[PDB]
Amino acid sequence: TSQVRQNYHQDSEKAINRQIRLELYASYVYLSMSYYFDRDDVALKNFAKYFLHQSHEEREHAEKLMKLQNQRGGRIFLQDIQKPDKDDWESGLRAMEKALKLEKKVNQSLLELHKLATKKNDPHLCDFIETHYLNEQVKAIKELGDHVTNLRKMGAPRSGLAEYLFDKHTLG
Amino acid sequence: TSQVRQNYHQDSEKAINRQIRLELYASYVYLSMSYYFDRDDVALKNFAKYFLHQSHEEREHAEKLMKLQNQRGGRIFLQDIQKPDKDDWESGLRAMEKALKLEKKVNQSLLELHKLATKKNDPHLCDFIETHYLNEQVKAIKELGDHVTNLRKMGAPRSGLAEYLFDKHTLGD
Amino acid sequence: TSQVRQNYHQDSEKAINRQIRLELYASYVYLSMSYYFDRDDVALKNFAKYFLHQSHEEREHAEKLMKLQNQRGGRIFLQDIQKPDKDDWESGLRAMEKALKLEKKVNQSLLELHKLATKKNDPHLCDFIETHYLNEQVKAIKELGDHVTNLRKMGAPRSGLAEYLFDKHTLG
Amino acid sequence: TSQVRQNYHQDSEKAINRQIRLELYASYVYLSMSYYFDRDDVALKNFAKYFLHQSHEEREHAEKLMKLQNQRGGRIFLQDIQKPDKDDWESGLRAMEKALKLEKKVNQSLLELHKLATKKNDPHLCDFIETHYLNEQVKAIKELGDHVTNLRKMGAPRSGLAEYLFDKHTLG
Ligand SMILES: [Ca+2]
Ligand SMILES: [Ca+2]
Ligand SMILES: [Fe+3]
Ligand SMILES: [Fe+3]
Ligand SMILES: [Fe+3]
Ligand SMILES: [Fe+3]
Ligand SMILES: [Fe+3]
Ligand SMILES: [Fe+3]
Ligand SMILES: [Fe+3]
Ligand SMILES: [Fe+3]
Ligand SMILES: [Fe+3]
Distance from CA of D116 to the nearest CA of A (A): 30
Helix (H, G, I), strand (E, B) or coil at B136: helix
- The sign one gets for the Cα dihedral C51, C52, C55, C56 is negative
Interface of D with A (CB under 8 A): 142, 145-147, 149-150, 152-155, 162, 165-166, 169-170
On whether the CB atoms of residues A31 and A52 are closer than 8 A, the answer is: yes
3-state secondary structure A92-135: HHHHHHHHHHHHHHHHHHHHHHHHHHHHCCCHHHHHHHHHHHHH
Q: For an interface test with A, which of B141, B143, B151, B152 has the most A Cβ atoms less than 10 Å from its Cβ?
A: B141
D63 assigned binding-site residue = no
Fill in the DSSP letter of residue B154.
Answer: T
Which bound ligand lies closest to the C-alpha atom of D141?
A: 10
Fill in the DSSP letter of residue C132.
Answer: I
Torsion of CA D149, D153, D157, D162, to 10 degrees: -110
C124 assigned binding-site residue = no
Of the candidates C4, C70, C123, which has its C-beta nearest D130's C-beta? C123
Distance from CA of C153 to the nearest CA of A (A): 30
In sequence order, which ranges of C1-159 are alpha helices (DSSP H)? 10-37, 45-72, 92-119, 123-129, 135-154
Q: For residue A41, what are the domain limits?
A: 1-172
Q: For an interface test with D, which of C124, C129, C131, C135 has the most D Cβ atoms less than 10 Å from its Cβ?
A: C124
Distance from CA of B54 to the nearest CA of C (A): 20
On whether the CB atoms of residues B49 and B34 are closer than 8 A, the answer is: yes
* Residue C119 exposed, middle or buried by CB count within 10 Å (0-12, 13-18, 19+): exposed
Q: How far is residue B125's CA from residue B148's CA, in Å, rounded to a whole number?
A: 33
B145 contacts C40? CB cut-off 8 A: yes
At residue A51's C-alpha, the angle toward residues A45 and A54, to 5°, is: 140
- Residue D171 sits at φ, ψ, to 5 deg, of -110, -10
Q: Which amino acid is at B35?
A: Y
Give distance in angstroms: CA of C96 to centre of ligand 6: 34
Of the candidates A28, A41, A73, which has its C-beta nearest C40's C-beta? A73
Give distance in angstroms: CA of B60 to centre of ligand 5: 8
On whether the CB atoms of residues D138 and C72 are closer than 8 A, the answer is: yes
On whether the CB atoms of residues A51 and A99 are closer than 8 A, the answer is: yes
* Helices and strands, counts by H and E, chain B: 6, 0
Q: What is the CATH number of the domain that holds C115?
A: 1.20.1260.10
On whether the CB atoms of residues A137 and A109 are closer than 8 A, the answer is: no
Q: How far is residue C166's CA from residue C161's CA, in Å, rounded to a whole number?
A: 9
In our burial notation (b when 16+ CB lie closer than 10 A, e otherwise), range B64-91 reads ebbebbeebbbeeeeeeeeebeeeebeb
- Residue D7 sits at φ, ψ, to 5 deg, of 60, 35
Structure determination technique employed: X-ray
Cβ neighbors of C146 (< 8 A, separation 6 or more) are none
On whether the CB atoms of residues D148 and D100 are closer than 8 A, the answer is: yes
CA-closest candidate to residue B21, choices B67, B71, B82? B82
* Residue A57 exposed, middle or buried by CB count within 10 Å (0-12, 13-18, 19+): middle
Fill in the DSSP letter of residue B7.
Answer: S
* Partners of residue D162 in chain A, C-beta under 8 Å: 161
Q: What distance lies between CA D43 and its chain's CA centroid?
A: 24
A160 contacts D153? CB cut-off 8 A: yes
**Resolution in A, one decimal?**
2.0
Give distance in angstroms: CA of A155 to centre of ligand 1: 42
Q: How far is residue D114's CA from residue D107's CA, in Å, rounded to a whole number?
A: 10
* Residue A157 exposed, middle or buried by CB count within 10 Å (0-12, 13-18, 19+): middle
C41 contacts A3? CB cut-off 8 A: yes
Residues written for chain D: 172
- What Rg do the C-alpha atoms of chain D give, in angstroms? 18
- Number of domains chain B is built from: 1
D134 contacts C71? CB cut-off 8 A: no
Cβ neighbors of C31 (< 8 A, separation 6 or more) are A63, A66, A78, C51, C52, C55
H or E segment and range at residue B76: none
Q: What distance lies between CA D133 and its chain's CA centroid?
A: 10
B114 assigned binding-site residue = no
Q: Which amino acid is at D112?
A: E
CA-closest candidate to residue C101, choices C139, C65, C141? C141
Helix (H, G, I), strand (E, B) or coil at A43: coil
Q: How far is residue C144's CA from residue C156's CA, in Å, rounded to a whole number?
A: 15
Q: How far is residue B162's CA from residue C106's CA, in Å, rounded to a whole number?
A: 39
On whether the CB atoms of residues A103 and A25 are closer than 8 A, the answer is: no
- Residue B51 sits at φ, ψ, to 5 deg, of -70, -35
Task: Please count the other Cβ atoms lying within 10 Å of the Cβ belonging to residue D146.
Answer: 23
Distance from CA of C73 to the nearest CA of D (A): 8
A13 assigned binding-site residue = no
Distance from CA of B151 to the nearest CA of C (A): 9
At residue A29's C-alpha, the angle toward residues A27 and A33, to 5°, is: 115
CA-closest candidate to residue D171, choices D10, D46, D55? D46
Q: How far is residue D33's CA from residue D50's CA, in Å, rounded to a whole number?
A: 10
Q: How far is residue C24's CA from residue C59's CA, in Å, rounded to a whole number?
A: 6
C-alpha neighbours within 13 Å on the C-beta side of residue B56: 5
Helix (H, G, I), strand (E, B) or coil at C81: strand
Q: How far is residue D69's CA from residue D75's CA, in Å, rounded to a whole number?
A: 6
Q: Read out DSSP for D24-92?
A: HHHHHHHHHHHHHHHSTTT--HHHHHHHHHHHHHHHHHHHHHHHHHHHHT------PPP--S-S---SH
Helix (H, G, I), strand (E, B) or coil at A30: helix
A23 assigned binding-site residue = yes
On whether the CB atoms of residues B13 and B75 are closer than 8 A, the answer is: yes
In our burial notation (b when 16+ CB lie closer than 10 A, e otherwise), range B115-134 reads ebbbebebeebbebbbeebb
Relative orientation angle of helices A160-169 and D135-153, to the nearest 10 degrees: 120
Q: How far is residue B49's CA from residue B41's CA, in Å, rounded to a whole number?
A: 16
Q: What distance lies between CA A106 and its chain's CA centroid?
A: 6
Q: How far is residue B149's CA from residue B154's CA, in Å, rounded to a whole number?
A: 9
